[PDB]
């Protein structure tokens, strides 16, 4: 239905030991498709999905250039932040950037993003309106007044609405066989003793895409909000994801418990039990 395109950049300054390291990744929903690394041998925007490999030679040139300009921009921004936060040149710092767009089932614009972060905390972020900025601190306000005076947001709006959505649209049609194809979870149950009065029931879910899954547990008919250990959705290695939900039940009361699996790959949400 609804889709997303996101670009994540990371700039890590190396005190004295050469140029800072720049890593940039491009994602369409939960699937990565492009890569850039300042340490990598090519010094080019590298494909990481087969549906992007088809793209033109000047596409790769334009994309390499844009990401190359960014690496330079954030290495300058790392120097600017040392002045702004009055910090030593001997300390290693992190500068992260996220930008992208959301599209509806129809394919039209939904939301746009453009935000920075210095040393793990937020720095500056473009508001939902795509007209004003949000400065997290006093140092970020210097950037706010600069970009508001220069009318930067107008050029940001111009990309997010348009250049971005047309890009996502093209990427979706060119890779509909993988990006739009939903894989349902390959569910299974398990039981461990742990003690003579208690027992653990794990509700597994494997090989699914997209990553959004909702595994819930139930004692009788009602949902067990607490007492349910949920691991975070982890990647398999291939385009699929894995997740599990566990519950500590009183020994012998295993019949009372049922697991509710929710995924868009399923035509109706599953309800399972231990046997």
């Amino acid at each position: 239905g609804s889709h997303s395109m996101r670009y994540f950049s990371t700039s890590v300054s190396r005190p004295g030991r050469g140029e800072p390291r720049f890593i940039a990744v491009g994602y369409v929903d939960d699937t990565q498709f492009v890569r850039f690394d300042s340490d990598a041998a090519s010094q080019r925007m590298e494909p990481r999905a087969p549906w992007i490999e088809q793209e033109g030679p000047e596409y790769w040139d334009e994309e390499t250039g844009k990401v190359k300009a960014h690496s330079q921009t954030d290495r300058e921004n790392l120097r600017i932040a040392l002045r702004y936060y009055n910090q030593s040149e001997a300390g290693s710092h992190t500068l992260q950037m996220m930008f992208g767009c959301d599209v509806g089932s129809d394919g039209r614009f939904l939301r746009g993003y453009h935000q920075y972060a210095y040393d793990g905390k937020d720095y500056i972020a473009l508001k939902e309106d795509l007209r004003s900025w949000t400065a997290a601190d006093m140092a970020a306000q210097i950037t706010k007044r600069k970009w508001e005076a220069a009318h930067v947001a107008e050029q940001q709006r111009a990309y997010l609405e348009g250049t971005c959505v047309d890009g996502l649209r093209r990427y979706l049609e060119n890779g509909k066989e993988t990006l739009q194809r939903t894989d349902p979870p390959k569910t299974h149950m398990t039981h461990h003793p742990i003690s003579d009065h208690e027992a653990t029931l794990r509700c597994w879910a494997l090989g699914f895409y997209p990553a959004e899954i909702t595994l819930t547990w139930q004692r009788d008919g009602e949902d067990q909000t607490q007492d349910t250990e949920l691991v975070e959705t982890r990647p398999a290695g291939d385009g699929t994801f894995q997740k599990w939900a566990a519950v500590v039940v009183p020994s012998g009361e295993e019949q009372r418990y049922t697991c509710h699996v929710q995924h868009e790959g399923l035509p109706k949400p599953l309800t399972l039990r231990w046997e």
Binding site: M45, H70, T73, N77, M97, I142, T143, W147, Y159, C164
Partner: peptide
Amino acid sequence: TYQWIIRNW
């Protein structure tokens, strides 16, 4: 389709 990330802090 990468954006023109060129503005300084």
